[PDB]
Every structure is written in C-alpha cells, then in structure tokens.
Design a protein around this ligand. Structure first.
Ligand SMILES: Nc1nc2c(ncn2[C@H]2C[C@H](O)[C@@H](COP(=O)(O)OP(=O)(O)OP(=O)(O)O)O2)c(=O)[nH]1
Ligand SMILES: [Ca+2]
Ligand SMILES: [Ca+2]
Ligand SMILES: [Ca+2]
Length: 341
DNA sequence: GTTGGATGGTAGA
DNA sequence: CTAACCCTACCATCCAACC
C-alpha cells in the first residue's frame, strides 16, 4: 500500500503570483475584507516572503499591516483559486483515478498499482511536480507513505516545494520519536490533555489503559492514535463526497435586529442554494457568530428535500430562535445545508 | 440496548 | 468602527423514539 499526497505551496498567494508575475520575490498577502472598517478582516494566506515577518493565515489585516505596510494586499478571489485547483486535480487524476480530494489545495492518490516501490513512487512524485509546473506554474509539496496520516506528515516535513518519502522503517521511528502534537488531528486542546497524562509519543498510547485514555480525549481519537501506534492504520483513499455546503457573511456592524440581519442571511441563502447544484438537502442550519466570537447554531431536519422557498422561511424562524435564546448581538450570520438525498 | 437529531467542540483548510 | 474571515469533516453529549 502506497499513498502519494499533494499539497499546494502558499496556494492563494501563489495563484496571484502566477496571474501577476511582477509580485514574485516580494511579500503578498491575500485578504478577507469584512467591510466593517478601513482594512477590517483576516489574512487568508501569505507567501513565504511575508511569513518571514510573521504575516500568516488567521491574523487580522491591520495586524499584518502593522508589521508589513509595504506588502501587496490583494482581496481573496475564491472562484479563481477553485478554477486553478480543479485544473490541477484533473491533472492529478491522470496519475490515478483512485484520488481523494481533501480540500481546496490538497489530494491523496493511492498509487499502489502504478508503482512497484517507494523509489518509483518518489519518481512519480518528481513527474507530478513537473507536470503541475509546466501546466499551471504552481509549485507543490509531495509526501509519500504507507498511509494518509504519514503521507500528510511527510509533506509537512518537506514544505515548501519539497518531496519526502517516509518508508516502513521511518514510520517505526516516528511512532517512537515524533511529538504527538505533530500528529494530524491533534490540535491544542488534545495536545494539552495528552501532556498532562504524560503521552508525548504515539508509542505512549500503547502503554496506557484504554479507558483512561478514552476518558481524557474521547473514544474516536484514542482509537485513532492506538491504531497509528500499532502501525495498523489503513483508512482507504475514497472519492470525496461533500456532506455539507453553506455560506457565512460578516455584518457591517453587530445587531440583534431581524430586519438589519435579514439581508445578510438572504445573501447567504442565495449563494448557498446555488453552490448546491442539483444536490437536494434535508437539513438546514442557521449559524451565528456572536459579539464575542462564540459560534451558535439552530437547525432543522425535514423528512424531505428543502426547496429554496422552504429555506427562506425556515432560516428566518431559526434566526429568530437564536435571538430568542441567546441575548447577545450577532456579528456573522450564515446557513449550512446538509443531508443530501 | 440502536438510531439519529439538535447543538457545540475540535481540527485543519 | 478600533482584531479575529471562510469553509467543511468528524465526533461527543444530551436527548427522544424505537422495539
Ligand atoms: N479564509 C481562510 N483561508 C484559509 C485559511 N487557512 C488556509 N486557507 C486557504 C488559503 C490557503 O492558500 C489555502 C491552503 O491552505 P494551507 O493550509 O495549505 O497553507 P498554504 O497553502 O497557504 O501554504 P502552506 O502549504 O503552508 O505552504 O487554504 C484561513 O484561516 N482562512
Ligand atoms: Ca493544505
Ligand atoms: Ca498548502
Ligand atoms: Ca498539532
């Protein structure tokens, strides 16, 4: 079993660089402009030049400009990056129809039947990087291993523009030596819970009673970690099927007023109902980010498919339900459809 | 017991 | 308006309806 994983380098900003090659070699910051004030919103991503100075995904545009005023600030153009991504995913598909598109910028290929061994896998890696460079001028990192988890880890170790194999031997070694916080799926909350226990390595999860582990981090994560430590992990590459599709938007200002909020919710419903594209949902959820950034939602599952009209009607109800039960003002409002027929 | 719906938490893009 | 956007996957918990 051999998995090749592809993850595009500083994606949104690299696309902008390809579109406008004069930007290459200099700082580039792609931004989500909330419209609340002069330069409100967050950085979606930045090129390596900008990251040198602490500008990265997630920080507020004004914070980025405080540390890099001279940089080039471009507004996120999601549709453009999705079109470049699709062209890339289809090139990848020529290397293996057995492909799992995991996100806007990354994909797992099962290549067990394209290559005999890791050295051939590595070579196909080199070919992939070249095709994507010839055809779309986008550099990418490649990670190759026996499974998804370690292929992802491998690419994390190779960024940017890299290529890493983690073979059966180094998987053994990493199980013993890799900080467990570097395992995909282990964020801040879990990592702090593991350290309290004294679990620092995947191998540690084997020297602890299951129920005390499951008691601290939940069953599923614990099962997953043990699986990895035993080297018995093997979740197959599967064709991506979207389980939910939604839209969320930021308001010019915070409100509790239904009439002040409706235009945003309706903007988001229209945009959502359009991304559905022949998919028919049975559940709708109205999602509200509050004053203090706490996320709050109200939903309904119907026994049947929701028409756009039903969606209009029910979301307004749901929104009112939020207002009725949470006494805080709202700052972002959206809607998410799920349970496709 | 099982299934699944409502709602929130965690993670990562 | 004074910093914090966008989108999706998965799981846990507290439930109720089932039989
Ligand atoms: N709006 C928004 N978009 C994000 C965020 N994080 C990532 N993205 C988008 C923009 C990125 O270019 C794209 C891929 O994200 P990645 O995590 O892979 O990092 P990126 O590709 O930018 O460079 P990376 O591989 O480190 O070199 O997804 C975020 O917090 N907000
Ligand atoms: Ca990525
Ligand atoms: Ca990337
Ligand atoms: Ca981590």
């Amino acid at each position: 079993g051999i998995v090749l994983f592809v993850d595009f380098d500083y994606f949104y900003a690299q696309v902008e660089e390809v579109l406008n090659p004069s930007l290459k070699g200099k700082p580039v910051v792609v931004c989500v402009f909330s419209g609340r004030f002069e330069d409100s919103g967050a950085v979606a991503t930045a090129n390596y030049e900008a990251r040198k100075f602490g500008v990265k995904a997630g920080i507020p545009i004004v914070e980025a400009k405080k540390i890099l005023p001279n940089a080039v600030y471009l507004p996120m153009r999601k549709e453009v990056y999705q079109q470049v991504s699709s062209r890339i995913m289809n090139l990848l598909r020529e290397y293996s129809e057995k492909i799992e598109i995991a996100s806007i910028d990354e994909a797992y290929l099962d290549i067990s039947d394209k290559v005999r061994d890791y050295r051939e896998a590595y070579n196909l890696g080199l070919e992939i990087k070249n095709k994507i460079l010839e055809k779309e001028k986008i550099t990418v990192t490649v990670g190759i291993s026996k499974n998804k988890v370690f292929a992802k880890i491998a690419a994390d170790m190779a960024k940017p523009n890299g290529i890493k194999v983690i073979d059966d031997e180094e998987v053994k070694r990493l199980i013993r030596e890799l900080d467990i916080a570097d395992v995909p799926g282990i964020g801040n909350i879990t990592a702090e819970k593991l350290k309290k226990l004294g679990i620092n390595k995947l191998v540690d999860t084997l020297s602890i009673e299951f129920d005390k582990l499951k008691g601290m981090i939940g069953e599923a994560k614990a099962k997953y970690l043990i699986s990895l430590a035993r080297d018995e992990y093997n979740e197959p590459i599967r064709t991506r099927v979207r389980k939910s599709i939604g839209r969320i938007v930021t308001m010019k200002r915070n409100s509790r007023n239904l009439e002040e909020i409706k235009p945003y919710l309706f903007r988001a419903i229209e945009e959502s109902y359009y991304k559905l594209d022949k998919r028919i949902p049975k559940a709708i959820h109205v999602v509200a980010v509050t004053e203090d950034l706490d996320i709050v939602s109200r939903g309904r599952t119907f026994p049947h498919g929701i028409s756009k009209e039903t969606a209009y009607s029910e979301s307004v109800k749901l929104l009112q339900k939020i207002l009725e039960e949470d006494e805080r003002k709202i700052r972002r409002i959206g809607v998410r459809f799920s349970k496709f027929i």
